[PDB]
Amino acid sequence: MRFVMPGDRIGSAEEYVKGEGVYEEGGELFAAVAGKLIIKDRVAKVESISPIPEIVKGDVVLGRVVDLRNSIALIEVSSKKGENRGPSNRGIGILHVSNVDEGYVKEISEAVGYLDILKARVIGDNLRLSTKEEEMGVLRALCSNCKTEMVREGDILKCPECGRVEKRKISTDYGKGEW
Amino acid sequence: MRFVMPGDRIGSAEEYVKGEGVYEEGGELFAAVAGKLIIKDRVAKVESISPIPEIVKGDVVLGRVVDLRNSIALIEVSSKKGENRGPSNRGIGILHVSNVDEGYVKEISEAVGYLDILKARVIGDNLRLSTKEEEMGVLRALCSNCKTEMVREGDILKCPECGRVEKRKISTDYGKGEW
Amino acid sequence: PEDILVDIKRDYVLSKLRDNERIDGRGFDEFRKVEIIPNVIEKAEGSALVKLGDTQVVVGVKMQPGEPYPDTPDRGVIIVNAELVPLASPTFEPGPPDENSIELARVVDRGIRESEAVDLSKLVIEEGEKVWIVFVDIHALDDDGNLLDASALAAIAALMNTKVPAERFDLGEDYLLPVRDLPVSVTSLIVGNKYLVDPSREEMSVGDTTLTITTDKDDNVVAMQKSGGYLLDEKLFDELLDVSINCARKLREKFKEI
Amino acid sequence: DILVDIKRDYVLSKLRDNERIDGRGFDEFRKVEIIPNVIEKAEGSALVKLGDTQVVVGVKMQPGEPYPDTPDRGVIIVNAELVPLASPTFEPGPPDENSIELARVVDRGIRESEAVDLSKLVIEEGEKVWIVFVDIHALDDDGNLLDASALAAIAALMNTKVPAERFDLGEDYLLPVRDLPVSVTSLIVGNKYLVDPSREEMSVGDTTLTITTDKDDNVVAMQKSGGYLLDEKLFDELLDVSINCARKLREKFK
Amino acid sequence: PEDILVDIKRDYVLSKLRDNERIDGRGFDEFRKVEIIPNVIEKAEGSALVKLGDTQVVVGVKMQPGEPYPDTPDRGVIIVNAELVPLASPTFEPGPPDENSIELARVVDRGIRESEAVDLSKLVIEEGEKVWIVFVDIHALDDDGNLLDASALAAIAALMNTKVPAERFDLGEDYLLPVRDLPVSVTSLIVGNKYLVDPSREEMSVGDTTLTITTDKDDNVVAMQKSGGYLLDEKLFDELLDVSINCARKLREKFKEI
Amino acid sequence: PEKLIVDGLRLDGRKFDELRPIKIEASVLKRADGSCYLEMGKNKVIAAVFGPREVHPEHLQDPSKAIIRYRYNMAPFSVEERKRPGPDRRSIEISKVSKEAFEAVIMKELFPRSAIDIFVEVLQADAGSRTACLNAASVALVDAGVPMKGMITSVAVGKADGQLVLDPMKEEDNFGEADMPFAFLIRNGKIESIALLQMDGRMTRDEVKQAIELAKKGALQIYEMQREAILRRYIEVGEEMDEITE
Amino acid sequence: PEKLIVDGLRLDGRKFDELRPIKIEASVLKRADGSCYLEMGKNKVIAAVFGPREVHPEHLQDPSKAIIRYRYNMAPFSVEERKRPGPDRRSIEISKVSKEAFEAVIMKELFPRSAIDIFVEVLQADAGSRTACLNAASVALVDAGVPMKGMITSVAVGKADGQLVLDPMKEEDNFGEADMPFAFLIRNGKIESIALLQMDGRMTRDEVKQAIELAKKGALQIYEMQREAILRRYIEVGEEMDE
Amino acid sequence: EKPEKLIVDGLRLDGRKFDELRPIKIEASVLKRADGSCYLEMGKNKVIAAVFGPREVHPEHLQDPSKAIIRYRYNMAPFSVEERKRPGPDRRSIEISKVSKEAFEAVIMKELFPRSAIDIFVEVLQADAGSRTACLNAASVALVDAGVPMKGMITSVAVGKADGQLVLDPMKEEDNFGEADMPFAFLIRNGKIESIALLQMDGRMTRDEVKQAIELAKKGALQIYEMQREAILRRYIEVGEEMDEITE
RNA sequence: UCCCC
RNA sequence: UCCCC
RNA sequence: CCCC
Ligand SMILES: [Zn+2]
Ligand SMILES: [Zn+2]
């Protein structure tokens, strides 16, 4: 049986190297989580029965715009695609104008808007985000005027209430309730 | 007897110049605090039975790093050496990369880290700080990783459980439980 | 920040609603599976656990001798309270009942009181000195939507399995609380000019705009509560009235057991 | 908060060399001082200083209904106020965590040792009984208010006069007291203990253990507190030491 | 934020004061128009609405039999409470009594109590058993300054128009509450070494620095209260003592139904 | 009480479809942005509106719209036996539904990061006080010029001796078979929809639907009274603007 | 009342060193991050773990580690006489010492600025409810995958008619001479250290040390049940995937 | 039980004359942890005062940009009164706290400590008539002991009225059965009464009696004030000798 | 102190 | 008005 | 309640 309870001894610190789910104390390695003990290339890790997601480079991510500067969008990143558990490192991510569309985008405001909900790919430490891929972008936007949920109109967002129209980097999933 | 109580009339505004421990009203000077009345060079002051510490250009201070910038680092100044009472002018004091070791330090994070307990001297208004002195610098550092308190070893700091090592402007008092 | 997942779920629910569907395939006047399990807390005088879909609630009943109220001697007393405890939802917060908790408990209380499910005259011990007091306490276990109806179900079920603790207060022999009606509440999520009977937590992401209707065993309406910031279309209310009465009849059936 | 950390460093340095910052032995209480009758008007009362830690305990007595449960006994109620007076740390609010805990520990020592003969405090059974309010008021917090308060409380009870005449219940008389619960708290730091922690010592963290014994050296209540793991061997040792200290403390009552 | 208009208004009042004038042309010892309307709440035992300039407050009185105080087995009880509800003033917040509201109720109570306006011993029903309890409940409607004097006026007017509810409580014929004095309070804004009797809200922009003096029928001082963070000149106090007794007398003469 | 209805007349002489006496007065409070004093039978209520003001604390703020707050409070002397001040479960419940009734009508999108506060005070209570307050509050809102889709108008229907009655009195509430408060949105001079609906008691399905018809008839009548209070206010500001000119 | 022990047997039939029947089940709550339902004698108990989650507001945020909250709460209907809802001195005390036990164990340095919240509700109370709760809480934490040094396992020892008794029942608590809750850290499959210790009553110095040995034996037994419960869950999550 | 008399042969129930204070004891620096403190007796009153500040923001929103805020809390211990009193503030304590705070706001140079708090706690360990005046005296001593700059000192006494006669510093009996009770506190500056920092009264007094009461209170106030000065002088000697105690 | 007011 | 649960 |  490869299953281990937290506190189960895996061996000396010198026999194996500490990996995910395992901790070092008094020269020993122990399980920190219940799950399947796995050892590969001297590395001990426990695959936990309940993994706490960690956002890393390459992950896909759901977030909300909480502040726009001039060449910068501050994104409240909250969820990591493929996992319902709240990420260990929820926080503020940064969306620079460069990574919005891989085109030319003067104001970051032409792409992203205050309180927009948005789907992105992590491309660096500290939650560095990109929306370049077609799958990425805004998923839900509210009308600047009447705060009404904008509706996708071809390749433009339009308020169905006041008729206003606004333009952003729209994700292909906009309005589908999925990401 | 030179003792005075607050409210006690010292003299006339014209007669003397108001100094510390004295206030003025309707042309007359009074003691603001209890203590010893002293008149030197026409200046009236009262040495208070319980001085309230003022941090001024030159004082030796105890602070903690609350924010790190590029060249600027924000240190929360909480004490004035030689006086247990909280200083009236507690606050935020900016430390610069130039004022660190009298050498060269690009990474401001090369001498002072986050949450580090530090010992500095004041060099300008606004709690402008510096530690170009052997006696100054970090007194108690935490590992970036395991957050463990790092112990001192020669001219370097090492985690007695993570092994990993960090370096920074070490105060000759680091780990002494004294400053 | 928790808002974010919920706003997206909202778009999904509305998208399916636009195509005349619910995300779990249920019909618009269809309840999730109901499970009603009596006697789950032995110490209590009466009790019931209810599972409604994945929503779970337990209701305990406690009885003890007490002062009647000066306004109405000759009358036993019933007091309903709910704890929507942090153990049920990431959003339930430790402290005194919020409005929601007060509202839920009062709607449950209203069903029982107006249907006269419990004969309070029979709970009189002494004229205007001693009378039985019935405590009904609702404890949310798992909130996956419509704690309200789950709680109404569990409360009336627990009353139905309640043993009057006579031979402990030396008031004689233990007897079953006589229950003479079966209040059932039906709550629907109103979305624009549509309704969804028995909303799930996911569906609730659209907003907290509901209608609850409660009936007795003869299909009389005994309590109603509109809740949330919206305007209720009268025509929709009419349809939802007949629907609700019907749904309550079916639920009421689950109390036969056989 | 910054200062506490540095002082924490200093405390640990001297711990390593197996010596406390003030040169006490790891099993040594600071100077204890018990002044009874500090609040005339109170039916009982006492002030205790333990080093620079100061606490006063007042006792009040009045007739009242007995709890339905036990209609054949008087009542003892213990409360505490860790008033902002004792340190810049205490907050004006209602009894918080620490204060509830301190008062309950004091209560348990008194209750489990059965120092007061609750049966002697009945007036008319099932209707009338004496209620003993024991109120603890911290004055100066220099560490281990717990042991000070426990001392102070039993002193005050031993100096209590039942106000019978006031209530037309016959002559006044001394509250009969038949045991001397004393409590002993030590700071635990890893595998080491420091009996009677000073507030300065408490800079390492709020990781303590408290043992309370009676007249005959039986343990009557205990309480581990704080976020730390207690080693069983240490416990065994500290048990005997604690019984020891309690015996010594007890003689300050004679 | 709110401070800004107030601060400017403070300059205006102070500017006028420097030229020996008030905002609205009143003298420094002059009350605004007072209006006293009894019986505005029929369901109450006694009640009164007072208008003091644009300031409005209503007081209602309720009496019910009850427990006497162990220390005072031969005396009825009077309890005064005030609500300075958000309804009056954008500054008033919701919640239990603020210290402002506790202060106000206590000043009104002190006037009524120390003048012995109501014969408490005549409110005994059964020594040590049953005694009348008088609830004086003050309710601000419109705060345009000096709710304190307005309330004191409304409270005594209400007491003077109270009817003991003996019948309702099977205790005999109803009767008018015996009122034997007429407490009136006079409140001044103190600015430096000047006073302004009956400050308007606009005048209060200067600061919350007041002096209240209450007298009985015979011009005895019966309660006084200095409030706010200022130093009171003793010479000013002496002059204001006299002015106030006088003002109180004039006020007292408005109760002649006048 | 023996019977509540005799020869088709109620204890107070009303017919089944007849309102209690009503008085509505706008602008009665100097220190409030809008206000209304309202009597409904023996109910005496006073309503006050403050806003759009800044929101305290700064965290209850909503970045996309005004927040609405509504407090229904019963003065201690407003009931037969003195009521200990401070909210109870019932008042909190009432404050919530009343809030929700207006959340539906007030144009909150116009005032991001703001509060609109509605305080309603019952000075004398009888049956249907929560209905009296909604009527006052709605008037007070209009007096305050806060933008709304239309009017909120409220009345309850009761059931006495098996018969539906408009605007129940105290005896009918306590001794009758049902009580059912409504409030409607009125637009284009017509009932448009339901802003508040509650009910307790025992009604057949047909009675429920009939109750709505009865309530609407009554609400229209009250609505003309609300309009008239506002019309007088309109007349008063205009003739004052002539007083200055005079 | 008359006697607690007759002929080596306790009132309910058990031996001086016998647990009451225990029952442990992981993942019983959809909405929580981890959960456990647990019976201990007539104790019925349920724990839910939420976290690591963002702490609200922020005056509670810790930059270096995570914070642990624990709330022991009794449902009104869980005791012989309806208990009025809400905090309570005993409850507050129990929550404090319970949270202290997990602070000594949860790897809180792993999650800075986060909260790990633990809720335990006693649905039916008997003697040792706090003990039942600590057991459930530990299982819920493991269920929720929060890194820990090892298990927390808890039992109380009583004293009856002069004799130490494992896992006291109501009557023993009420009429016994002592009652002493424990919790231990379990690592390398053994009782390592003491995470919780409380005693009220009257005990000789030796009785106390004896009581610890008695507690540890019960604990090991309970710990194994905690383990099987986690083992079932582990099988269940694998079966899940295979779907 | 009502004394019936109160004044006999020009003597009060405790033996004093109409213009005599109760025995008083004042001691500064009695607490280690406070910035300033004072233990004070005044008749049967036993009170303790403690000062912390200037400190804090604080909390956050409470902070005042242009000046310090002052807080003063008056609190009676459960055992300080005849019948054990449930802990927590009541309306009376709230009122006493507010007016006490007000007396000091008038005198502390708060402009010197923007965005700070100076906190004042006073605890009634044993209560008799005038406990609010006792606390005010103890608090001013504590403030001076903590060296917080002030216009002058705060000194406080009540005048009562018994059997028609004004008396200085009433005792419990005179309070309970007398005709009036009137606490004062004054600012002392340049060794004398400069103004009124606190004034309250209840009961029944003539305009003339009110004016005579002020005269009586000022007299008593000057007596107490010298005690306060003495208590601080002693403290002055202590930090003096304990200084060159290090250099010795 | 439930429910109504 | 406690203490156990 | 008020006084403490
Ligand atoms: Zn729009
Ligand atoms: Zn490290």
* CA count, 13 A, side-chain hemisphere, D125: 4
The CA distances from residue G76 to B4, C46, C80, G80, G81, in Å, are: 65, 13, 11, 10, 8
In the complex, which nucleotide's C1' lies nearest to the CA atom of residue G79?
Answer: J5
Task: Look at D214 and G202 and tell me if their CB atoms are within 8 Å.
Answer: yes
- Please tell me whether residue C15 adopts helix, strand or coil conformation: helix
Amino acid whose CA is nearest the C1' of I1: C69
The answer to whether D32 and B91 are in contact (CB under 8 A) is no
Tokens of E45: 């035992």
Residue G126 CA, distance from chain mean position: 13
What distance in Å separates the CA atoms of residue H179 and residue E115, rounded to the nearest whole number? 11
Tokens of E208: 């919350």
Specify the CATH architecture of the domain B139-172.
Single Sheet (2.20)
What distance in Å separates the CA atoms of residue G226 and residue G136, rounded to the nearest whole number? 8
What distance in Å separates the CA atoms of residue A116 and residue A67, rounded to the nearest whole number? 10
What distance in Å separates the CA atoms of residue B80 and residue B83, rounded to the nearest whole number? 6
What distance in Å separates the CA atoms of residue F26 and residue F236, rounded to the nearest whole number? 10
| Residue A114 with chain F: CB contacts under 8 Å | 63
Of the partner residues C40, C47, C90, the one whose CB lies closest to the CB of residue G31? C90
What domains sit in chain H, N to C, each tagged with a CATH number? 19-248 (3.30.230.70)
Query: Cβ within 7 Å of strand I: which of F 203-242?
Result: none
Question: What phi and psi values does residue F139 have, to the nearest 5 degrees?
Answer: -65, -50
Q: What is the DSSP string of chain G?
A: ---SEETTEETTS--TT-PPPEEEEE---SSSSEEEEEEETTEEEEEEEEEEEE-SSSTT--SSS-EEEEEEEE-GGGSSS-PPSS--HHHHHHHHHHHHHHHTTB-GGGSTTEEEEEEEEEEE--TTHHHHHHHHHHHHHHHTT--BSSEEEEEEEEEETTEEEES--HHHHHHSSEEEEEEEEEETTEEEEEEEEEEEEEE-HHHHHHHHHHHHHHHHHHHHHHHHHHHHHHHHHHHHHH-
Which chains, if any, share at least 3 CB pairs under 8 A with chain D?
B, G, H
The CA distances from residue C69 to C65, C123, E166, in Å, are: 13, 13, 21
- Please tell me whether residue H155 adopts helix, strand or coil conformation: strand
Triad E154, E157, E158: Cα angle to 5°: 85
The CA distances from residue H240 to D52, F166, H50, H227, in Å, are: 21, 86, 22, 20
- Please tell me whether residue B88 adopts helix, strand or coil conformation: coil
* CA count, 13 A, side-chain hemisphere, F61: 11
To the nearest 10 degrees (0 to 180), the angle between helices D145-158 and D97-112 is: 40
User: Can you say whether residue E245 is alpha, beta or left, with left for phi > 0 and alpha for psi between -120 and 50 degrees?
Assistant: alpha
Residue with tokens 């999730």: C32
Strand C130-142 relative to strand C184-191, pairing: unpaired
Look at residues D180, D182, D152 and name the one whose alpha carbon lies nearest to residue D49. D152
Tokens of B108: 């401001």
- Please tell me whether residue C156 adopts helix, strand or coil conformation: helix
CA A140 to ligand 1 centroid distance, Å: 14
Tokens of H91: 């309306």
Task: Look at F64 and A146 and tell me if their CB atoms are within 8 Å.
Answer: no
Strand J positions within 7 A of protein Cβ atoms:
1-5
Query: Cβ within 7 Å of strand I: which of C 79-98?
Result: 79-80
* E strand residue ranges, E103-183: 124-126, 130-142, 163-164, 175-176
Tokens of G48: 């839910």
User: DSSP state, F241?
Assistant: H
Task: Look at C87 and G119 and tell me if their CB atoms are within 8 Å.
Answer: yes
Tokens of C50: 């209810």
**Where in chain B do CATH 2.20.70.10 domains reside?**
139-172
User: Can you say whether residue F68 is alpha, beta or left, with left for phi > 0 and alpha for psi between -120 and 50 degrees?
Assistant: beta
Residue with tokens 């014929």: E173
Look at residues D126, D122, D112, D39 and name the one whose alpha carbon lies nearest to residue D78. D112
Task: Tell me if chain F has a CB within 8 Å of the CB of A142.
Answer: yes
The answer to whether F120 and F72 are in contact (CB under 8 A) is yes
What distance in Å separates the CA atoms of residue H79 and residue D45, rounded to the nearest whole number? 9
Query: Cβ within 7 Å of strand K: which of E 168-187?
Result: none
- Please tell me whether residue D187 adopts helix, strand or coil conformation: strand
The CA distances from residue F39 to C239, F42, F126, in Å, are: 36, 7, 10
Q: Which DSSP helix (H) or strand (E) runs through H176?
A: helix H172-177
Q: How many other CB atoms are found less than 10 A from the CB of residue D108? A: 24
What distance in Å separates the CA atoms of residue H159 and residue H221, rounded to the nearest whole number? 11
What distance in Å separates the CA atoms of residue A140 and residue D108, rounded to the nearest whole number? 60
What distance in Å separates the CA atoms of residue H170 and residue H176, rounded to the nearest whole number? 10
Size (chain H), residues: 248
The answer to whether D139 and D49 are in contact (CB under 8 A) is no
Task: Tell me if chain A has a CB within 8 Å of the CB of C3.
Answer: yes
What domains sit in chain C, N to C, each tagged with a CATH number? 6-258 (3.30.230.70)
What distance in Å separates the CA atoms of residue A118 and residue D6, rounded to the nearest whole number? 46
Amino acid whose CA is nearest the C1' of J2: D77
Residue with tokens 């003539």: H206
What distance in Å separates the CA atoms of residue G52 and residue G67, rounded to the nearest whole number? 9
The verdict on domain A1-52 having CATH code 2.40.50.100 is yes
**Where in chain B do CATH 2.40.50.100 domains reside?**
1-52
Tokens of F101: 């009734």
Task: Look at A78 and C14 and tell me if their CB atoms are within 8 Å.
Answer: no
CA A166 to ligand 1 centroid distance, Å: 10
| Residue B33 with chain H: CB contacts under 8 Å | 144, 147-150
Residue E197 CA, distance from chain mean position: 14
Which chains, if any, share at least 3 CB pairs under 8 A with chain F?
A, C, E
What distance in Å separates the CA atoms of residue F150 and residue F85, rounded to the nearest whole number? 34
| Strand-pair partners of F156 | F181
The answer to whether E159 and E255 are in contact (CB under 8 A) is no
Binding residues of A for Zn(2+): 143, 146, 159, 162
B and H in touch (3+ CB pairs within 8 angstroms): yes
Integer-rounded Cα radius of gyration of chain F: 19
Strand K positions within 7 A of protein Cβ atoms:
1-4
Residue with tokens 């004035």: B80
Just give the CATH number of B53-138: 2.40.50.140
The CA distances from residue B15 to A55, B10, B12, B28, B44, in Å, are: 72, 10, 5, 9, 9
The answer to whether G137 and G130 are in contact (CB under 8 A) is no
The answer to whether C117 and C181 are in contact (CB under 8 A) is yes
What distance in Å separates the CA atoms of residue F58 and residue G241, rounded to the nearest whole number? 47
What distance in Å separates the CA atoms of residue C219 and residue C226, rounded to the nearest whole number? 19
Residue with tokens 């004039």: E250
What distance in Å separates the CA atoms of residue E191 and residue E208, rounded to the nearest whole number? 10
What distance in Å separates the CA atoms of residue D144 and residue D53, rounded to the nearest whole number? 8
Triad E251, E253, E255: Cα angle to 5°: 90
Q: Which DSSP helix (H) or strand (E) runs through C158?
A: helix C147-160
Strand G163-166 relative to strand G151-160, pairing: antiparallel
CA B165 to ligand 2 centroid distance, Å: 7
Look at residues G128, G107, G117 and name the one whose alpha carbon lies nearest to residue G47. G117
Question: What phi and psi values does residue H65 have, to the nearest 5 degrees?
Answer: -65, -45
To the nearest 10 degrees (0 to 180), the angle between helices G205-242 and G129-143 is: 40
Look at residues B142, G145, G187 and name the one whose alpha carbon lies nearest to residue A20. G145
CA A170 to ligand 1 centroid distance, Å: 18
The answer to whether F48 and F118 are in contact (CB under 8 A) is yes
CA A142 to ligand 1 centroid distance, Å: 8
Cβ density class A96-108: b for 16+ within 10 Å, e for less: ebebbbeeebeeb
Strand B35-40 relative to strand B3-4, pairing: antiparallel
| Residue H36 with chain B: CB contacts under 8 Å | 50
The answer to whether D157 and D113 are in contact (CB under 8 A) is no
The answer to whether D208 and D42 are in contact (CB under 8 A) is no
- Please tell me whether residue H221 adopts helix, strand or coil conformation: helix
Helix (DSSP H) and strand (DSSP E) numbers for chain H? 4, 11
**Where in chain B do CATH 2.40.50.140 domains reside?**
53-138
| Closest chain H CA to residue E226 | H199
Amino acid of residue E253: E
The CA distances from residue C2 to A63, C5, C6, C141, G116, in Å, are: 10, 6, 7, 21, 16
